[PDB]
């Protein structure tokens, strides 16, 4: 009654029904490497890094949105788990150009951290690397759409919580541009929240753009001003 | 060095100035940075 038992690497823990595998792993502490999930946004199984192996299953379950049935046992550190993570990391790193110095998320990338702690180190697919030209989003955001990994986090957040309904996917395959097709100046409320929710350096701050870097700055307590919500 | 004395670039001192320190004409440093916070301009017209 109201308690479902899962065996994360053998260890039993109680999980409420209707919740994902990922909330159970965070309940026992495991951070599954993820790119397109967000803990406050709607879930869509895109990034594929959330794979994990449950035994007696030939396919590999995308644990970003996998519900929890009765009585599970999960191998978080199986061999094909590591193979799948190395593989998805190997796929993502082709069509992302050599821009990590001139990017603005040097200490604050996500590809870099999970590629260190999960991926390989000797790349392949020696030529290729498509180049997609950006749009003119607005004065508030500096936009380099070439680094867009098409993770579809800005679109979901935009159309649901912002409701502006203008970030569109155009095309198929390698040619899938994110944004408004007709170069409308993206001016709406909450249009500045997007520059950090974009997990890669596709979007960035316009005044901050080429000034500094997060390993220099120290971090300090404050409360919101000019608004009584805080 | 008669095999390749120059390079084909337009930035190079033709002088080869010597060790310029210990002279009346040598380096002194300074912070190459503009105005910090643009201190406030008082009003122009006098009142009362």
């Amino acid at each position: 009654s109201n308690l479902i038992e899962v065996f994360v690497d053998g260890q039993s823990v109680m999980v409420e029904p209707g919740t994902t595998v990922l909330q159970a792993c965070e309940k026992v502490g495991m951070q599954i490497p993820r790119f397109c999930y967000h803990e406050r946004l709607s879930v869509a199984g895109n990034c594929r890094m959330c794979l994990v192996e449950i035994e007696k299953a030939p396919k590999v379950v995308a644990a970003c949105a996998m519900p929890v049935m009765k009585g599970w046992n999960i191998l978080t550190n199986s061999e094909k788990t590591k193979k799948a993570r190395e593989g998805v990391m190997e796929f993502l790193l082709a069509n992302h150009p050599l821009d990590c110095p001139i990017c603005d998320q040097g200490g604050e990338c996500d590809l870099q951290d999970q590629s260190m702690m999960f991926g390989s180190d000797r790349s392949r697919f020696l030529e290729g690397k498509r180049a997609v030209e950006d749009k003119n989003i607005g004065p508030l955001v500096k936009t380099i759409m070439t680094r867009c990994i098409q993770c579809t986090r800005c679109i979901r957040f935009a159309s649901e919580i912002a409701g502006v309904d203008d970030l569109g996917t155009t095309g198929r395959g390698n040619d899938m541009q994110v944004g408004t097709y007709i170069e409308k100046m993206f001016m709406s409320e909450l249009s500045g929240n997007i520059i950090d929710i974009c997990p890669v350096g596709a979007l960035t701050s316009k005044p901050y753009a080429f000034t500094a870097r997060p390993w220099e700055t120290r971090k300090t307590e404050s409360i919101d001003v000019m608004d009584a919500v805080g | 060095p008669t095999v390749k004395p120059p390079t084909a670039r337009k930035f190079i001192w033709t002088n080869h100035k010597f060790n310029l320190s210990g002279t009346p004409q040598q380096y002194v440093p300074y912070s190459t940075t503009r105005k910090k916070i643009q201190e406030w301009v008082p009003p122009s017209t006098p009142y009362k």
């Binding site: 909330q23 803990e39 709607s42 519900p67 649901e160 950090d196 300090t220 | 912070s31 910090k36």
Partner: protein, 126 residues
Amino acid sequence: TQLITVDEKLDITTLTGVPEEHIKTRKARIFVPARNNMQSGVNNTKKWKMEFDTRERWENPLMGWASTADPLSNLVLTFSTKEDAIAFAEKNGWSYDVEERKVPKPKSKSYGANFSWNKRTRVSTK
């Protein structure tokens, strides 16, 4: 072997050699640091960080640096529980402000209610 002992607070604050100016003037702050919200990593949690308050950092008039008269502006101490923080701050004497640890909220999400029939949850594009 169960000797003299009297039970009080501890008096390491006279032993640590820092003057009473920086004892009573500067004040400590004890908190769990923020999740760096651009990334998504709660690995920087589980660490009660002890910090101080920053003070003046004027400009170096020849080089343009952060010329500061603050020896204690560059310390951070890693703790396990809040009790260790309170015992440490009362051990070494200076004042403390402890903030409360604010965990995340386990929130229910479901793909079926994301793509249901007559509700208002409809993403209309994916």
